[PDB]
Design a protein around this nucleic acid. Structure first.
Ligand SMILES: [Mg+2]
Ligand SMILES: [Mg+2]
Length: 188
RNA sequence: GUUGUCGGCCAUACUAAGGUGAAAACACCGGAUCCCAUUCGAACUCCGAAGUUAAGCGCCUUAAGGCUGGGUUAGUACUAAGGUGGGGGACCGCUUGGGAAGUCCCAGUGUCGAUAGCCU
């Protein structure tokens, strides 16, 4: 249980993804040289986890292995303003029992970390995806001209109203909990 | 720079068609009385010195074949450890380690000697 600072006060409401930048270099490590540095953006729940994500992708993308290189640094990135709602696009590859797939997904959230967490839960529930399998190709905070999904564009209007049609009874604290009460609740 | 003699490694030395050839050697070359030799002096053996680089041989030539070394191939195939991982299964994949080979590329193409010499 280690929180990143930009996570909510209630741990419940969001997953423990954080967004990392990791960068490393070919091991020989020649001093005065101007090294090729390999840098990548990973989403993980740890520094360790991030390192893994890093290396996996890196050994797939290029010749390098870990005994062949060194980790220069791992730096968590944060979201600018948690005051506004943004529409995020994400581009994925994941692995389904048959084959591998490229998906584009959109979520309306306050954080790119939130965008990701929601992405994972969704991908589990609807697609039975395994986290380890998921590869996020590219992520963009979306400009309105660019938002393509109906359940996304669905929420743009000021005239938005939800009645709350059914209120399921939920006592305020536990101190108030009773199995059986002397009269029936209401919905509304 | 070049030669014979005996060589270690045994193609980067082999194969094919060519150019070139100071000197000295090596050879091709001349000849069968003698030791030796065969169906045959071809060869093997012996004795030589009229010719000759034409052979052998040195050195090089080929968008040459081969061989040698790297590149791609490819972090692919295969593989070590873990898995109350997925899949009806065949099988696939997650975490931590090792990691190849042919097509196609590019380069190389004999090296190390002891001994006596040629180039005054
Ligand atoms: Mg070869
Ligand atoms: Mg293959």
């Amino acid at each position: 249980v280690r929180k990143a600072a930009q996570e909510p006060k209630d741990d419940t409401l969001q997953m423990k993804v954080r967004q990392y930048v990791v960068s490393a270099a070919r091991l020989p490590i020649e001093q005065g040289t101007k090294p090729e540095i390999l840098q990548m953006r990973v989403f993980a729940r740890d520094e360790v986890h991030a390192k893994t994500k890093f290396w996996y992708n890196m050994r797939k993308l290029n010749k390098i292995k870990r005994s062949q290189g060194r980790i220069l640094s791992v730096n968590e990135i944060y979201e600018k303003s948690l005051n506004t709602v943004k529409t995020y696009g994400i581009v994925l590859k994941y692995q389904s029992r048959t084959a591998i797939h490229n998906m584009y997904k959109e979520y309306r959230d306050v954080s790119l970390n939130g965008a990701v967490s929601q992405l994972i839960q969704d991908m589990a529930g609807n697609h039975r995806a395994q986290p380890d399998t998921i590869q996020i190709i590219r992520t963009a905070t979306l400009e309105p001209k660019d938002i393509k999904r109906p359940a996304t564009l669905a929420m743009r209007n000021a005239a938005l109203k939800f009645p709350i049609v059914k209120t399921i009874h939920r006592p305020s604290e536990k101190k108030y909990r009773t199995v059986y009460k002397a009269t029936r609740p209401t919905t509304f």
